[PDB]
């Protein structure tokens, strides 16, 4: 039965997802922090206007 369904070797890991979660939680924490209002001020009226 394991031969028939034939999972590749073992690939069900919980790896790179963890570091992706780390990066995105860091980003969302930065989104609610300082220097980011200045960042968006730089985005606004210097890129479009």
């Amino acid at each position: 039965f394991s031969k028939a369904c034939a999972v590749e070797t073992k690939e069900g890991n919980i790896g790179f997802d963890v570091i992706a979660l780390s990066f995105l939680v860091f980003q969302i924490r930065i989104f609610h922090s300082w220097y980011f209002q200045h960042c968006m001020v730089e985005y606004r009226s210097e890129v479009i206007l």
Binding site: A20, S22, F23, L24, F26, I28, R29, I30, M40, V47
Partner: protein, 393 residues
């Protein structure tokens, strides 16, 4: 000669200032490694008392005498007998009593290192007493001091979450399931919810640690009794029963529990203790700026502009981390999505493509119609989907 002597004096002073606050952590790590080396039965009282000490100079001498008792002891269905299961293996006579025990006697000196500073101090909690974070960007040395002094007050919640994630990664059991359920509960709420629930979480895990170690050590071999959890399964092979027991982390005869679990939960203990220690001295720095409830730019900020006046390199570092960090995190999430092979990978792909498709037009605070609030709603949806993915896996 004089300059070298002054540099040596500065180095020894700074390492002493490091030690006077890090000897406790260093000795705890050393003891954890040593008890991971020997996971026999007689290690229950010591892990219990270390857990109690972490939960709370009266406690400083509790383990000092017991390690001497261990040093006293180390000098003293079947297939194994009482002394070996206890943790006292009768080695070959005539070889050595100190054959591989070169750290316990050093550990006594380690306790002395923690005791000499205590005795000579009472006869402040900062290595750098002239620290100033007002203009931390005016010097790279000041930036390093910021990273080493307030580096945990700033992001302690994040590093504790990382520790929990790595524990789940190296744990992979029902304990990992409850840990990721706690992660889901924590990540989907504001600061007040964790403010209220962290004490319950830390006491629950502090109580769970001793029970985990009791499960690890197990039962005496010649007890003339069989574990009930070895005969729940009616009509499946014995290997299935072994897998079920291992996944639920229950004691079984002739088990060889690796030290990775103990290392992970010990680091969880230390991160929780540090988080609580900084959590007592709570302030207003680790609070969201959206508590006022509007998305408009705050008229006056307590920090100067960083995009201009690019001086030194720490300003460049802030610009890189605050201006293109979302590109890095989207790269990481796309790599994680493409690494896997499942419908969860497809969800990651579609979410990251629809996130990257809105480059800059959607990053505008122009009143309503998908403003900053909707951007944070989408990001919270990303958090929810990622936690759903990990818990489902």
């Amino acid at each position: 000669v004089k300059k070298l002597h002054k540099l040596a004096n500065q180095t020894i002073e700074l390492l002493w200032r490091f030690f006077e606050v890090h000897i406790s952590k260093i000795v705890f790590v050393i003891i954890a490694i040593f008890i991971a080396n020997n996971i026999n039965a007689l290690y229950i009282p010591l892990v219990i008392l270390l857990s109690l000490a972490i939960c709370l100079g009266i406690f400083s001498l509790f383990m000092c005498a017991y390690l001497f008792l261990v040093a006293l002891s180390k000098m003293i269905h079947g297939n194994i007998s009482m002394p070996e299961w206890f943790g006292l293996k009768k080695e070959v006579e005539g070889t050595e009593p100190i054959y591989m025990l070169f750290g316990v006697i050093v550990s006594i000196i380690a306790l002395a290192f923690q005791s000499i500073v205590i005795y000579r101090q009472r006869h402040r909690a900062k290595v750098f007493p002239d620290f100033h974070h007002s203009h931390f960007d005016r010097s790279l040395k000041n930036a390093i001091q910021f990273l080493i002094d307030y580096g945990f007050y700033k992001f302690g919640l994040e590093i504790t979450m990382i520790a929990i994630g790595i524990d789940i990664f190296n744990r992979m059991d029902a304990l990992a399931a409850i840990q990721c359920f706690w992660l889901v509960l924590f990540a989907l709420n504001k600061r007040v919810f964790v403010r209220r629930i962290w004490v319950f979480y830390v006491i629950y895990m502090a109580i769970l640690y001793p029970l985990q170690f009791f499960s690890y050590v197990g039962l005496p071999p010649d007890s003339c009794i069989e574990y009930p959890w070895s005969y729940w399964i009616p009509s499946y092979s014995d290997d299935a029963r072994f897998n079920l027991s291992y996944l639920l982390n229950l004691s079984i005869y002739g088990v060889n529990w690796p030290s990775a679990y103990l290392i992970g939960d010990f680091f969880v203990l230390l991160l929780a203790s540090c988080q609580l220690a900084v959590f007592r001295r709570e302030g207003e720095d680790n609070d969201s700026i959206y508590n006022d409830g509007n998305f408009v730019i705050k008229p006056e900020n307590p920090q100067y502009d960083f995009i201009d006046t690019k001086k030194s390199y720490v300003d460049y570092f802030k610009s890189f981390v605050f201006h293109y960090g979302h590109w890095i995190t989207l790269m990481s999430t796309l790599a994680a999505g493409i690494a896997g092979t499942s419908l969860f990978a497809l969800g990651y792909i579609i979410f990251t493509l629809t996130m990257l498709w809105s480059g800059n037009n959607l990053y505008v605070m122009n009143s309503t119609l998908r403003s900053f609030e909707h951007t944070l709603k989408r990001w919270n949806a990303l958090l929810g989907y990622t936690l759903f993915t990990i818990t489902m896996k």
